[PDB]
Symmetry: C4
Subunit: 388 residues, 4 copies
């Protein structure tokens, strides 16, 4: 069993074709399915699994009330083959209100975080045993990706952030080998707030499109040199911009260098990836709410500032439906390494208040160089059929 | 691990012996079992699984209401070992309101179709990753087999149809190798409407008995030359005829050449297979409704037009019970390749309206050269015990 | 992978130690557990499974009403690792209201029987495919063991009976190799009614202690010569006698030669096995009802007629509790082949009528040459907590 | 496959990092989860499982009433991968109201005990078959560890006690090889009552910190020489002391030699382990009730009597929450063998009487040489949401 060194061309995609959907909320109205959020998917060298931080409970359970809160000690990381809902027989792989998992080619690494917000711990579980651990360094909610990390030749990288959301914070880059933290590089380059990175390999390095929760609606980038642990940060060039809230295509800017200062603050976990001077990217269709989800390429979006020439658009979830977080995931082909993405379809609380709980389902699409049609694949549950 | 080249005599069967039954509807009145339809079964080189397109829900769930509709974005392809009902822990292998799956001897291919009816996409998933994709070519509900496809030496064939049900349409033949579409032959021969093919290998080729939803109650045939992608079509010779609705044994014809123009239009997925100049075939016992199911051989049924000399009849489901779709599936023995078949037992809506849902159970029998008795194995659920 | 030739001394046991219990009825009052009966257990070369013919339904389901009836088309053979209840995710391995399963050392053979009582079929499923089939030969409820069969060097033997319960019948002995019936020897020796045999290997042969449902309360024996298919029958010598109903230890006889003609007719599936001139045997403690269960050795019980000198008694289920069928099962050790037994604990209908259903749980003990104490392990369910 | 000889340094830990949590009680208010108690965890050479003696029932089941009682014949030993709750599909590996399981490196040994309290039997199950058995030797509730045992080079050791709780009793040490009891050493050294040992390897021996239910609040030690079966007993030196009830840190003593005679009698299963002249130990935070749970090192705690200089404290469960039993478990790293521990979080009856049942959830932490924060991870269920 060799290690994943991911040495292969990124496949030249033509768009995304539907891959999987789990129908959790729909199934939750007549079945014992966990309450989750902040989901993601990642595959070992043979198959894909789906993760999500449950809420230590089930939907049709009085305990689901007030599940809007992100961090309680009962959130553990769930893991099932892709396509199988989070039913009672699901393995809570670790305790965590934050996470990242990846397979170096020989085993699974899971970085789980629970604890006081002011003093939390991150355990590094690999191959079943707990190899290392680390503690909060800024005393203000130690956080990580909420999606897969990446390993090249045995050394995995996962970024983490401790500090203020709506403010300045401390972002670091962990290089771990076999569960053991072997180097921590801090953030460098022009980025002003790195949160929830969506990372993918670009041999010999790792690239991430993160979330600026402070001053940018445009997305930061993080370049990790695997060879020496050096790091560089920037922003996307596309004036198209992919964060919510955002300004709006016409009055939207990005110089790839600094936060755009347009509706900047908050955001949502999202992704994007390069292809030449181009960018493949997805965002909610709504710029105020996390509603609907669309994808499209942007000619120039990578290398040329404020470019807004978009082509190959696609709606994954129509605007009249709720979406949420989104990340990317890579998958090795016989000839190239293809990129895919998942979309969190959050329901219930804060927004919908008929019910007192909050959960979600997922939808995943994968890059294809084939052909495809049109559609819309939302959660699908009728809130008036749902418990509570 | 070699590839399945299926080079072996078709076993000389004497009839069919019971193989499996899942009791889904019965179990659904006190258990969380998915709502499905358009089922089928297929085996890898070691075991058999059962597929079905669920309805993104469970029976005892308010969401099962109005599940009579064939295509919503929540239909995904379910897959379990043969004999295990579709419970919450079932893996939705892909998103699809149409499908075909087959194992080349090294891995599983699944062709799933979801999307707009006017613009749908078909994803080609193999070995876990999404290798290819294709789009609607006639803009009118891209469709496929609803049963297993077949692979000879690494190249799998699955047929698909886009166009008008009750009208003329565009039928093509896909040859895919390792998830990658490697050639598309269009329809040839005398066939007027090819829908829902039931294909089986006849080394060095593949033979299908399909569904003419336009002008024939007799069933079309499709011959696929694996060696060169050439294709020929015909109709069955048996005046016995196997589609529903149909005329009736005495006033029923078939010249094996053209649609019989007798109650022709609509139909139902069915199967049949040759043995010399003979044909083994099954159809509902009812010629108006999909009620009951019988099988029998027809001396001459293959090679001699309008032959109606049937022998070895067998009732699988008595006429006082509902049946539905039906397909075939092959299984390699130590000496020959035996053919088997499954029967969809659809319940609920449109016909039975006490309940507002629609689902089904299955029953499967396999060819035997032994002896057997008599019986009847219907769904078994008491609609007055059922939810809704 | 070699074949099981079972060439090893029967371990010199000192009694039985508790092995497994599933708690089905208890679990059925708050969980979806199948309705079953006529259970049994058997192990492959690495682990043991538990079988039972379900009733195509769940206990807390309106469909469980009137489950007292033995043969409906919905009874299928369930199979799980030993210790895991028959929950929704259980695989119905085949359709059957009668059965026997055994592992030749390379694969599992399952003989399943469904169909008309007057015309039923028995399918021979091996390694996943249906290799053979046979039909009713006396037109009066084709039956088989209801427990494991045995294979020596690749040829498995399973006995079957068609004919009258309370009368004369046709009993045959099937020798099948790889699912294919390869010889049928008919019954020979002094036995008058062979039903529900409990067979175990005694290299180079197979020995069975069956059920005389016509004229004997003492149990028939069946000797199968694997080397030539010859067969001999007898009865047990023990005047202690193990069938229910029976006369009673003091006024009970057996000459090992003919049916005792004492409360003879009906009976229940049971077992016994030899050790020198001795016999290890179990029976219900009640001689009218299937209540409680006891085991004990009988000095002389094998070779000396009407012997009633019993030692090492043990109560498995106290007399104030219900039991039922019982069979034996062998398990290969590193030095000898040990024999074990299971007990069916049937509840509900006919006897208990608060509820309208009928099901059961199991308890299994294994031979030990160690020490042990005393106890009683009944079903445990409180009928007043149970559904219906 | 070699045997586990555990030849490696105990890792130099810096404290414990969160490892797993199952959320059983929380999940039990809307899901079918077994009623258990006296849990524990142990890993084979690749993964960890969690055990617990169920109560032959489910929480939302009328049968859970009066589950406060420790020994009924329906208690069987449950086993699932670590992180997966005890749902209906759980395998009851054996019948037992007492237990210990361990993996010699080639297979699992389970010592299960059921039977009369006055006359009980202990079955030795290994590799699936029941290899040996033993009977009560003092006729007064034969008992064992309630946690993992340890095997060095093929010979596993498990200690057991028969006799009076609140009195003098007979404690023995079993050395079993492949399920076969191969030597029984009786207790030696200064210990006055050994119950519920928490054992761990210290090559070439095994060390246990047990429970004195008679005259000590300080914990006994048991030294097992694997090389010759010799045995020595003592008490911990720490004046800090780890049993509940206990006196209180300031007025607490221990000379490592004799029971402290301070609130001595009853107790609770707990653990501790040495590191030089130091001791890592955990106890409830409450000295009257089993409430909350804390851990800390004690400088001198191993080798110097009445030492109370504690450092590196950590609260696992805050004092305002219930805890219970606790044991240790070892896990082999690539360089050293690390020790971990689990905590039973018992709820319901005797203490909380809103509900009539009694069950629990678990929390497990593992030794780390990294860093960590602060927190509290209790059961989490709201008793007013719970059934009954
Ligand atoms: C593959 O498949 C696409 C599917 O496209 C998308 O369609 C829907 C909207 O985006 C959406 O549910 C789904 O998620 C797909 O992303 C094929 O074409 C698609 O066709 C539809 C229908 O023609 C287009 O939808 C438009 O937007 C509104 C909602 O869909 C609708 O109100 C519009 O109404 C009027 O326009 C249509 C032309 O689109 C015309 O037929 C009528 O005159 C209609 O009349 C109205 O006039 C006023 C408002 O429009 C009102 O006062 C009056 O009441 C009435 O509403 C319009 O239909 C959709 O935008 C288009 N999508 C794409 C992607 O092209 C597409 O053919 C093919 N493309 C590819 C790349 O594969
Ligand atoms: C293996 O096992 C078969 C089983 O055959 C099938 O039987 C049932 C009908 O097909 C069905 O449930 C099951 O699915 C099987 O496919 C053995 O024989 C079978 O026997 C039955 C009973 O004799 C035959 O059934 C006939 O059809 C009606 C329903 O089953 C029934 O109404 C008929 O009634 C009269 O006929 C019987 C002769 O069949 C006779 O005993 C009586 O006189 C009875 O009297 C009536 O007279 C009028 C109508 O018939 C009425 O006015 C009056 O009220 C009363 O109803 C009839 O019984 C079945 O057709 C036959 N099947 C097969 C396959 O041969 C078979 O022996 C063996 N064969 C093989 C190849 O293995
Ligand atoms: C290992 O463990 C056994 C357990 O044996 C079995 O005990 C119970 C009955 O068989 C049963 O639940 C369980 O399934 C076991 O198979 C050890 O000994 C056992 O001890 C019990 C108690 O002494 C014996 O039971 C007898 O039968 C009745 C029910 O158990 C009970 O009513 C009897 O009552 C009188 O007898 C006892 C002596 O047994 C005496 O202590 C009292 O004087 C008591 O007084 C009565 O007098 C009249 C009726 O007896 C009434 O008018 C008045 O109200 C009152 O009831 C009796 O207790 C059981 O038979 C015996 N079993 C075995 C197997 O020996 C055993 O020590 C050890 N053996 C082995 C091989 O391991
Ligand atoms: C890593 O993270 C720890 C977390 O420590 C623990 O905190 C809580 C108590 O132990 C517990 O939920 C959790 O399980 C952890 O084990 C970091 O520090 C921790 O900080 C807290 C808050 O400062 C400490 O808690 C103390 O105890 C009570 C409950 O937590 C609380 O009532 C106390 O109140 C007063 O003290 C604080 C100082 O601790 C001060 O800010 C206020 O003045 C407050 O005012 C009160 O005055 C009177 C009573 O105190 C009342 O009349 C009036 O109403 C009001 O209550 C106090 O806060 C906790 O002990 C401390 N824990 C540790 C482990 O140090 C820690 O910084 C870091 N350490 C390590 C090794 O990683
Ligand atoms: C990933 O794996 C390859 C495996 O060797 C690393 O490249 C090796 O580089 C040395 C010089 O550093 C050559 O001798 C090896 O033989 C190289 N590979 C090959 C295929 O020849 C590579 O640097 C690793 N590190 C990273 C970040 O990708
Ligand atoms: C299926 O597999 C066989 C495997 O070789 C293909 O047949 C081969 O044909 C060539 C000439 O085309 C011979 O040299 C090979 O050695 C043949 N097989 C054997 C066993 O000798 C066959 O044509 C393949 N294609 C199809 C449709 O079946
Ligand atoms: C079970 O297996 C053995 C395997 O060979 C069979 O015994 C063989 O008998 C022949 C003569 O028939 C010897 O040459 C073989 O080498 C024998 N075995 C051994 C170990 O030498 C045996 O007869 C088989 N049949 C039955 C009923 O047990
Ligand atoms: C304990 O177990 C290990 C693993 O079986 C034994 O393995 C060998 O011993 C050393 C290093 O452990 C070398 O002699 C071999 O090449 C090792 N093989 C492996 C896999 O490590 C070791 O002999 C046993 N040690 C003791 C002290 O009993
Ligand atoms: C555990 O395993 C080792 C494996 O051999 C045992 O140690 C062996 O001791 C003999 C003398 O008794 C040496 O020749 C072996 O080669 C030793 N091991 C090594 C690695 O050399 C050891 O005693 C066993 N027993 C216990 C309690 O640990
Ligand atoms: C880690 C964590 O729980 N912080 C957090 C996160 N990650 C997400 C959200 C949110 O976008 O709703 C809100 C949050 O407070
Ligand atoms: C693919 C699809 O959903 N079309 C379709 C199919 N396949 C079957 C039926 C039907 O026979 O009820 C009806 C239909 O409309
Ligand atoms: C095979 C079958 O269903 N016959 C049968 C059997 N096997 C058992 C019993 C019974 O003992 O209740 C009763 C029966 O009628
Ligand atoms: C073995 C057993 O059931 N005895 C026992 C045990 N082990 C524990 C407790 C208890 O601490 O509640 C109480 C008990 O009576
Ligand atoms: Ca922002
Ligand atoms: Ca038609
Ligand atoms: Ca009888
Ligand atoms: Ca004590």
């Amino acid at each position: 069993v060799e290690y994943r060194n991911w040495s292969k061309p990124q496949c030249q995609i033509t768009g995304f074709a539907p891959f999987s959907k789990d129908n959790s909320i729909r199934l939750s109205a007549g079945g014992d399915i966990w309450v989750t959020r902040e989901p993601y998917v990642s595959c070992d060298p043979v198959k894909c699994y789906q993760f999500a931080l449950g809420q230590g409970t089930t939907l049709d359970n009085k305990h689901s009330n007030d599940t809007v809160h992100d961090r309680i000690p009962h959130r553990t990381l769930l893991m099932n083959e892709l396509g199988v809902p989070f039913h009672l027989g699901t393995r809570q792989v670790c305790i965590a209100w934050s996470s990242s998992s990846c397979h170096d080619g020989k085993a699974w690494l899971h970085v789980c975080i629970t604890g006081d917000d002011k003093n939390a711990t991150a355990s590094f579980i690999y191959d079943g045993r707990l190899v290392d651990s680390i503690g909060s360094w800024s005393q203000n909610i130690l956080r990580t990706q909420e999606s897969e990390c990446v390993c090249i030749n045995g050394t995995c990288t996962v970024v983490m952030t401790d500090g203020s959301a709506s403010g300045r914070a401390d972002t670091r880059i962990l290089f771990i080998e076999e569960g053991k933290i072997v180097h921590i590089s801090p953030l460098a380059g022009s980025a002003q707030h790195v949160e929830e990175c969506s990372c993918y390999p670009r041999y010999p390095g790792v690239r991430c499109i993160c979330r600026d929760n402070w001053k940018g609606s445009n997305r930061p980038v993080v370049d990790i040199n695997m060879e020496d642990y050096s790091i560089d940060s920037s922003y996307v060039c596309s004036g198209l911009v992919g964060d919510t809230p955002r300004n709006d295509d016409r009055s939207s800017n990005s110089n790839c260098r600094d936060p755009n200062n347009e509706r900047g603050t908050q955001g949502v976990k999202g992704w994007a990836f390069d292809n030449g001077n181009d960018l493949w990217m997805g965002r909610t269709i709504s710029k105020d709410l996390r509603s609907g989800y669309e994808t499209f390429k942007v000619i120039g979006g990578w290398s040329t500032p404020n470019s807004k020439s978009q082509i190959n658009r696609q709606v994954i979830v129509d605007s009249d439906n709720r979406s949420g977080y989104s990340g990317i995931f890579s998958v090795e082909g016989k000839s190239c390494i293809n990129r895919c993405f998942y979309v969190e379809l959050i329901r219930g609380r804060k927004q919908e208040t008929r019910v007192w709980w909050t959960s979600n389902s997922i939808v995943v699409f994968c890059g294809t160089s084939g052909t495809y049609g049109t559609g819309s694949w939302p959660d699908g549950a009728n809130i008036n059929f749902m418990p509570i």
